Amino acid sequence: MVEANLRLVISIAKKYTNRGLQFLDLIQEGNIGLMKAVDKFEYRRGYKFSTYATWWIRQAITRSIADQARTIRIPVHMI
DNA sequence: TCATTGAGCAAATGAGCAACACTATTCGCATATAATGGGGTTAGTGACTCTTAAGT
Known part of the structure:
Protein backbone atom coordinates (compact mmCIF):
# COMPACT_ATOMS: atom_id res chain seq x y z
CA MET A 1 0.00 0.00 0.00
CA VAL A 2 2.89 2.41 0.67
CA GLU A 3 4.81 1.83 -2.57
CA ALA A 4 1.84 2.62 -4.81
CA ASN A 5 1.12 6.24 -3.79
CA LEU A 6 4.58 7.82 -3.83
CA ARG A 7 3.41 9.84 -6.85
CA LEU A 8 0.85 11.42 -4.50
CA VAL A 9 3.72 12.47 -2.22
CA ILE A 10 5.63 14.12 -5.09
CA SER A 11 2.37 15.73 -6.24
CA ILE A 12 1.83 17.33 -2.81
CA ALA A 13 5.47 18.32 -2.24
CA LYS A 14 5.74 19.88 -5.72
CA LYS A 15 4.22 23.10 -4.35
CA TYR A 16 6.27 23.39 -1.12
CA THR A 17 9.60 23.46 -2.99
CA ASN A 18 11.13 26.92 -2.45
CA ARG A 19 10.15 27.30 1.21
CA GLY A 20 13.63 26.92 2.71
CA LEU A 21 14.02 23.15 2.33
CA GLN A 22 15.35 20.84 -0.38
CA PHE A 23 12.93 19.02 -2.68
CA LEU A 24 14.13 15.58 -1.60
CA ASP A 25 13.65 16.31 2.12
CA LEU A 26 10.01 17.23 1.38
CA ILE A 27 9.11 13.96 -0.35
CA GLN A 28 10.98 12.00 2.33
CA GLU A 29 8.92 13.58 5.13
CA GLY A 30 5.87 13.11 2.92
CA ASN A 31 6.68 9.39 2.81
CA ILE A 32 6.76 9.40 6.64
CA GLY A 33 3.31 11.01 6.65
CA LEU A 34 2.15 8.50 4.02
CA MET A 35 3.15 5.61 6.30
CA LYS A 36 1.30 7.26 9.21
CA ALA A 37 -1.78 7.55 6.98
CA VAL A 38 -1.54 3.91 5.84
CA ASP A 39 -1.38 2.66 9.44
CA LYS A 40 -4.52 4.56 10.52
CA THR A 71 18.37 28.33 12.46
CA ILE A 72 16.36 30.50 14.85
CA ARG A 73 13.44 28.08 15.16
CA ILE A 74 10.00 29.48 15.93
CA PRO A 75 7.37 26.96 17.11
CA VAL A 76 4.27 26.49 15.00
CA HIS A 77 1.86 27.98 17.57
CA MET A 78 3.92 31.19 17.89
CA ILE A 79 4.24 31.71 14.12
C1' DT B 1 47.07 55.41 84.45
C1' DC B 2 46.78 55.13 79.12
C1' DA B 3 47.95 53.98 74.04
C1' DT B 4 49.01 49.72 71.47
C1' DT B 5 48.61 45.10 70.08
C1' DG B 6 46.08 40.42 69.89
C1' DA B 7 41.61 38.27 69.73
C1' DG B 8 36.96 38.00 69.14
C1' DC B 9 31.58 39.07 68.66
C1' DA B 10 26.69 40.80 67.75
C1' DA B 11 24.54 42.62 63.95
C1' DA B 12 23.31 44.13 59.18
C1' DT B 13 23.41 43.04 54.55
C1' DG B 14 24.21 40.13 50.36
C1' DA B 15 23.61 35.47 48.48
C1' DG B 16 21.07 31.57 48.10
C1' DC B 17 18.35 27.11 48.78
C1' DA B 18 14.21 23.96 49.34
C1' DA B 19 9.79 22.74 48.78
C1' DC B 20 5.49 23.95 46.80
C1' DA B 21 1.76 26.25 43.92
C1' DC B 22 0.21 28.60 39.70
C1' DT B 23 0.89 29.31 34.61
C1' DA B 24 2.55 30.38 30.25
C1' DT B 25 5.07 27.17 26.57
C1' DT B 26 5.52 23.25 23.73
C1' DC B 27 4.62 19.02 21.58
C1' DG B 28 1.77 14.81 20.08
C1' DC B 29 -2.23 14.16 17.46
C1' DA B 30 -6.14 14.91 13.62
C1' DT B 31 -8.27 17.24 9.50
C1' DA B 32 -12.10 12.01 5.21
C1' DT B 33 -15.22 14.43 -2.56
C1' DA B 34 -10.93 14.23 -5.38
C1' DA B 35 -6.26 15.43 -5.64
C1' DT B 36 -1.02 9.94 -8.22
C1' DG B 37 6.71 11.66 -12.06
C1' DG B 38 10.80 18.34 -10.91
C1' DG B 39 13.30 22.91 -12.06
C1' DG B 40 17.52 24.80 -13.50
C1' DT B 41 21.82 25.66 -14.48
C1' DT B 42 26.50 27.44 -18.17
C1' DA B 43 27.11 28.62 -21.73
C1' DG B 44 33.10 33.79 -26.62
C1' DT B 45 38.25 30.23 -21.09
C1' DG B 46 43.58 28.73 -21.50
C1' DA B 47 46.99 25.75 -20.62
C1' DC B 48 48.62 21.59 -18.60
C1' DT B 49 48.51 17.01 -16.49
C1' DC B 50 46.63 12.39 -15.10
C1' DT B 51 43.71 8.50 -15.89
C1' DT B 52 40.74 5.56 -18.78
C1' DA B 53 39.47 3.68 -23.14
C1' DA B 54 38.95 2.29 -27.95
C1' DG B 55 42.07 1.82 -31.97
C1' DT B 56 46.69 -0.32 -34.29
Whole structure:
Protein backbone atom coordinates (compact mmCIF):
# COMPACT_ATOMS: atom_id res chain seq x y z
CA MET A 1 0.00 0.00 0.00
CA VAL A 2 2.89 2.41 0.67
CA GLU A 3 4.81 1.83 -2.57
CA ALA A 4 1.84 2.62 -4.81
CA ASN A 5 1.12 6.24 -3.79
CA LEU A 6 4.58 7.82 -3.83
CA ARG A 7 3.41 9.84 -6.85
CA LEU A 8 0.85 11.42 -4.50
CA VAL A 9 3.72 12.47 -2.22
CA ILE A 10 5.63 14.12 -5.09
CA SER A 11 2.37 15.73 -6.24
CA ILE A 12 1.83 17.33 -2.81
CA ALA A 13 5.47 18.32 -2.24
CA LYS A 14 5.74 19.88 -5.72
CA LYS A 15 4.22 23.10 -4.35
CA TYR A 16 6.27 23.39 -1.12
CA THR A 17 9.60 23.46 -2.99
CA ASN A 18 11.13 26.92 -2.45
CA ARG A 19 10.15 27.30 1.21
CA GLY A 20 13.63 26.92 2.71
CA LEU A 21 14.02 23.15 2.33
CA GLN A 22 15.35 20.84 -0.38
CA PHE A 23 12.93 19.02 -2.68
CA LEU A 24 14.13 15.58 -1.60
CA ASP A 25 13.65 16.31 2.12
CA LEU A 26 10.01 17.23 1.38
CA ILE A 27 9.11 13.96 -0.35
CA GLN A 28 10.98 12.00 2.33
CA GLU A 29 8.92 13.58 5.13
CA GLY A 30 5.87 13.11 2.92
CA ASN A 31 6.68 9.39 2.81
CA ILE A 32 6.76 9.40 6.64
CA GLY A 33 3.31 11.01 6.65
CA LEU A 34 2.15 8.50 4.02
CA MET A 35 3.15 5.61 6.30
CA LYS A 36 1.30 7.26 9.21
CA ALA A 37 -1.78 7.55 6.98
CA VAL A 38 -1.54 3.91 5.84
CA ASP A 39 -1.38 2.66 9.44
CA LYS A 40 -4.52 4.56 10.52
CA PHE A 41 -6.70 4.22 7.41
CA GLU A 42 -10.31 3.01 7.53
CA TYR A 43 -11.88 1.79 4.29
CA ARG A 44 -15.52 1.67 5.43
CA ARG A 45 -16.18 5.39 4.80
CA GLY A 46 -16.26 4.87 1.02
CA TYR A 47 -13.21 7.04 0.26
CA LYS A 48 -10.47 5.39 -1.72
CA PHE A 49 -7.07 6.34 -0.31
CA SER A 50 -6.23 9.85 -1.43
CA THR A 51 -8.68 12.03 0.51
CA TYR A 52 -7.36 10.54 3.77
CA ALA A 53 -3.68 10.45 2.77
CA THR A 54 -3.51 14.07 1.53
CA TRP A 55 -4.13 15.53 5.01
CA TRP A 56 -1.38 13.48 6.66
CA ILE A 57 1.13 14.16 3.86
CA ARG A 58 0.39 17.91 4.01
CA GLN A 59 0.71 17.85 7.82
CA ALA A 60 4.10 16.09 7.73
CA ILE A 61 5.44 18.43 5.04
CA THR A 62 4.21 21.53 6.90
CA ARG A 63 5.64 20.34 10.23
CA SER A 64 8.91 19.63 8.42
CA ILE A 65 9.22 23.12 6.92
CA ALA A 66 8.05 24.84 10.11
CA ASP A 67 10.92 23.42 12.19
CA GLN A 68 13.90 22.34 10.08
CA ALA A 69 14.01 25.36 7.74
CA ARG A 70 15.58 28.09 9.91
CA THR A 71 18.37 28.33 12.46
CA ILE A 72 16.36 30.50 14.85
CA ARG A 73 13.44 28.08 15.16
CA ILE A 74 10.00 29.48 15.93
CA PRO A 75 7.37 26.96 17.11
CA VAL A 76 4.27 26.49 15.00
CA HIS A 77 1.86 27.98 17.57
CA MET A 78 3.92 31.19 17.89
CA ILE A 79 4.24 31.71 14.12
C1' DT B 1 47.07 55.41 84.45
C1' DC B 2 46.78 55.13 79.12
C1' DA B 3 47.95 53.98 74.04
C1' DT B 4 49.01 49.72 71.47
C1' DT B 5 48.61 45.10 70.08
C1' DG B 6 46.08 40.42 69.89
C1' DA B 7 41.61 38.27 69.73
C1' DG B 8 36.96 38.00 69.14
C1' DC B 9 31.58 39.07 68.66
C1' DA B 10 26.69 40.80 67.75
C1' DA B 11 24.54 42.62 63.95
C1' DA B 12 23.31 44.13 59.18
C1' DT B 13 23.41 43.04 54.55
C1' DG B 14 24.21 40.13 50.36
C1' DA B 15 23.61 35.47 48.48
C1' DG B 16 21.07 31.57 48.10
C1' DC B 17 18.35 27.11 48.78
C1' DA B 18 14.21 23.96 49.34
C1' DA B 19 9.79 22.74 48.78
C1' DC B 20 5.49 23.95 46.80
C1' DA B 21 1.76 26.25 43.92
C1' DC B 22 0.21 28.60 39.70
C1' DT B 23 0.89 29.31 34.61
C1' DA B 24 2.55 30.38 30.25
C1' DT B 25 5.07 27.17 26.57
C1' DT B 26 5.52 23.25 23.73
C1' DC B 27 4.62 19.02 21.58
C1' DG B 28 1.77 14.81 20.08
C1' DC B 29 -2.23 14.16 17.46
C1' DA B 30 -6.14 14.91 13.62
C1' DT B 31 -8.27 17.24 9.50
C1' DA B 32 -12.10 12.01 5.21
C1' DT B 33 -15.22 14.43 -2.56
C1' DA B 34 -10.93 14.23 -5.38
C1' DA B 35 -6.26 15.43 -5.64
C1' DT B 36 -1.02 9.94 -8.22
C1' DG B 37 6.71 11.66 -12.06
C1' DG B 38 10.80 18.34 -10.91
C1' DG B 39 13.30 22.91 -12.06
C1' DG B 40 17.52 24.80 -13.50
C1' DT B 41 21.82 25.66 -14.48
C1' DT B 42 26.50 27.44 -18.17
C1' DA B 43 27.11 28.62 -21.73
C1' DG B 44 33.10 33.79 -26.62
C1' DT B 45 38.25 30.23 -21.09
C1' DG B 46 43.58 28.73 -21.50
C1' DA B 47 46.99 25.75 -20.62
C1' DC B 48 48.62 21.59 -18.60
C1' DT B 49 48.51 17.01 -16.49
C1' DC B 50 46.63 12.39 -15.10
C1' DT B 51 43.71 8.50 -15.89
C1' DT B 52 40.74 5.56 -18.78
C1' DA B 53 39.47 3.68 -23.14
C1' DA B 54 38.95 2.29 -27.95
C1' DG B 55 42.07 1.82 -31.97
C1' DT B 56 46.69 -0.32 -34.29
